[PDB]
């Protein structure tokens, strides 16, 4: 949100967080990369 682009997110504020060793390149869909890792560990608890 800090990055001011009005469209998507620039690579200059995200780092890598991937199995590579370089900054994220253009065209990579972070949103698809996101939103899926969060709920993947579906081993939470119910009924408190």
């Amino acid at each position: 949100v800090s990055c001011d682009t009005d469209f998507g997110v620039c690579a200059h504020c995200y780092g890598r967080d991937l199995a590579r060793g370089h900054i994220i390149n253009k065209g990579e869909a972070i949103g698809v990369i996101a939103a899926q890792s969060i709920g993947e560990p579906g081993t939470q608890l119910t009924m408190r």
Partner: protein, 147 residues
């Protein structure tokens, strides 16, 4: 953002799950859109404009021609089940929760999609503007300027 990320990482850490906070910030950013305005600002005397469109409009109107006409906005967050429906393309955000109301609203307003969401390219069945097809999508956008 800080409160949300702290609260969610507490829950993911009490169990043992280790996850970066950047995805959570992405969730917040997708969640934090659709600012509401109180001043007209010569933009529109209505409510429910996108934050990005408002920022682009104020950048193109203030610095260029008239900087005195300021449009004050209040950035109001919306829940996922509601913010997802807030899309400029009728095709997208349709199969998510409900279709008939979205179709009625699009036909009433007469909106056009431009096929900008990924689901649009999926349903039509072309290269999505991501990964390998990003360069092709960019070239198509570039050639669309001239004709």
């Amino acid at each position: 953002t800080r409160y949300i990320v702290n609260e969610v990482q507490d829950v993911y850490r009490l169990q043992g799950v280790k996850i970066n906070d950047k995805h959570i910030e992405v969730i917040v950013r997708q969640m934090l859109r659709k600012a509401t305005i109180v001043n007209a600002g010569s933009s529109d005397f209505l409510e429910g404009e996108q934050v990005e469109y408002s920022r682009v409009k104020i950048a193109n109107r203030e610095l260029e021609a008239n900087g005195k006409v300021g449009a004050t906005y209040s950035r109001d967050l919306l829940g996922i089940t509601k913010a997802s429906l807030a899309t400029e393309s009728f095709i997208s955000a349709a199969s998510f929760q409900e279709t008939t109301r979205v179709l009625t609203e699009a036909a009433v307003a007469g909106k056009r999609d431009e096929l900008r969401g990924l689901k649009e390219n999926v349903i039509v069945g072309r290269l999505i503007p991501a990964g390998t097809g990003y360069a092709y999508h960019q070239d198509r956008m570039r050639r669309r300027a001239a004709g």
